[PDB]
């Protein structure tokens, strides 16, 4: 069981754009240095969300075939997927990229950033659920690309063109599950379970912003 030279190429382009991404040291230092107040904790989270939006657009621009889509469809996909793509990356930073103590301070800041437990509880629940899968870098990269190249987002004028880009990634992901987890046939199904769980965050996120009066005009323009 192996990827074909074509699937190897498609995967390599995805892994390359994905491995470029890095959270700046200036943000990481703030988690460690700033005062532990709702004001400062919320500001760090705001700086994290803004940086993820920049990282997201750079990753997306390099997905094979993305530049070949109608221009307004590129915007519609980016707008449709930004919230889901954020939570997925944040799960990776929280469970893999951040030192144990740093993620502990980050969590501390998250739980003391004036945000309701209504939103905090499913967030950490999802982080624990994702961490349980012991996801490889290829699975994070593919899963992120599949979330972005989702053909059922609103205001997309040509869905078949997006379907043509998404199907080979799910095919690559399923083959990687067969190759690396042959004893675990439901591994692929587990990964799909995260796509549905990520979608719930679109609603959680939308209602959360309505309980703001915490108002960040830049992020609200992206989100709604």
């Amino acid at each position: 069981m192996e990827l074909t030279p074509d699937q190897q190429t498609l995967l390599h382009f995805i892994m390359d754009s994905y491995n470029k991404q890095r959270m700046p040291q200036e943000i990481t230092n703030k988690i460690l240095k700033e005062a532990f107040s709702a004001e400062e904790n919320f500001l760090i989270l705001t700086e994290m969300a803004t940086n993820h939006v920049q990282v997201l657009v750079e990753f997306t621009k390099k997905l094979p075939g993305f530049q070949t889509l109608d221009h307004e469809d590129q915007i519609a996909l980016l707008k449709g997927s930004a919230v889901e793509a954020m939570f997925l990356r944040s799960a990776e930073i929280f469970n893999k990229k951040l030192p144990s103590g740093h993620s502990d301070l980050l969590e501390a800041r998250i739980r003391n950033s004036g945000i309701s437990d209504e939103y905090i509880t499913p967030m950490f629940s999802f982080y624990k659920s994702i961490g349980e899968l012991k996801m490889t870098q290829e699975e994070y990269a593919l899963l992120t690309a599949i979330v972005i190249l989702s053909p059922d987002r609103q205001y997309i004028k040509d869905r078949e063109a997006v379907e043509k880009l998404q199907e080979p990634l799910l095919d690559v992901l399923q083959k990687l599950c067969k190759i690396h987890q042959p004893e675990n046939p439901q591994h692929f199904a587990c990964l799909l379970g995260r796509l549905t769980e990520l979608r719930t965050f679109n609603h959680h996120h939308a209602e959360m912003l309505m309980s703001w009066r915490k108002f960040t005009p830049l992020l609200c323009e992206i989100w709604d």
Binding site: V57, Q74, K79, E221
Partner: peptide, 13 residues
């Protein structure tokens, strides 16, 4: 509909 920031980020170099 305007989404100015996403437009700049996408259409940049």
């Amino acid at each position: 509909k305007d989404h100015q920031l996403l437009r700049y980020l996408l259409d940049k170099d």
